[PDB]
Amino acid sequence: YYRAIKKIKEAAEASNRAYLTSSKLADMLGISQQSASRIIIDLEKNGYITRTVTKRGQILNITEKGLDVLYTEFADLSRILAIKNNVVITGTVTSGMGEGRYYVARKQYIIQFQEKLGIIPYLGTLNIKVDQASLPELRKIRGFRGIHIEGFKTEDRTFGSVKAFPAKIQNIPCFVIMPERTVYTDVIEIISDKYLREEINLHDGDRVSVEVYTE
Template identity: 50%
Template sequence: MNETLYSAIKELKNLAGSKNIAYISSSELARKMGVSQQTASRIILELIKEKYIDRTIENRRQKIMIQEKALDLLYRELNELYSILKINQSFEMEGTVQNGLGEGKYYISKKGYMDQFKEKLKMEPFPGTLNIKINPEYENILRQVRGADGIIISGFKDRERTFGGVKCFNAHIDGIKCYLIFPERSVYTDIIEVISDKYLRQALSLKDGDIIKVNVDFEF
């Protein structure tokens, strides 16, 4: 990515804070970046075009909204720094057990996925996923996990359709080994899917609405 655009994203995110909204004029951004107002205006237009930010005008003020694409970019850089510095991290997230739509069983059971799970995760997952809605205070951790490389389960094609790749992350819940899984091409969501060689709902005596903690281990 163009370094100037990347610097602008970081500057705007710094101003936007946790709500990811900043009120700033092109001239103000220009002063902060040390560029001309015309250049700052072009930068904003380019970031809008590439869907890193969105913009509206409220009471004659320019409202900049940081988009998911920009946040993903920043968290990828954070993980790259941890990798370069060889810093291993463990994260804990808390959320509530959610009722799934039954799609997990369909996807997990596909041979193209199952063969790779056995090879790369060294286990045969129970045909289904445990869905957990992560509490808002753990959003930054969830974004960092999603932005990491993980263990890649490659996409494949069968007679029915094409299936996308999946990223897996080592985790455990109450001492039970499991993996967080994320479709590689998915939009941000606060619901995570967990797989294990055990039926987690039964093994942990879980029901919808139960509070649960998930520990994720990163090794860079």
């Protein structure tokens, strides 16, 4: 489905919507009209686009899952060709229930954070709600593999594999952690051996910049 999503995004230009016909997509791809029509139907069925289709053609909306196909390909090639592509994300500090402390305190995560990232972290995650204008940079980071943290099973629940990226928030070293199975939210989570709210005097609502190292 990669080539068709690539061409729909190219047609969508700046935005993530394109007004197209199956014939236009077909000739963009070097395939028959009938195949392009089928490809559009399958992309919608599998959640890569949403669409409105009439006898006047189609409005195709690339979803976050559709875009992730392209950003994942870009990250694959960046990694395989050793092309540097670090990222800056800006967002705002938020608070929650204490979910991050529950996760980070798991013994099976802690051992891996030390073995793979070299830290014993503060038990928690600093949540950052990414600004709308930084969403393309969030999509780019989510494309990359980062440092693999193996998931595990306990008696109460199952914990998925996560990926870690070396990062800096106001020049404080830290790591962005996200599930390897991507879920499209605007919230990123940061761990560090420093308690970041104290280290850099953060409050809910403060805007911060996070540099993320994808290599």
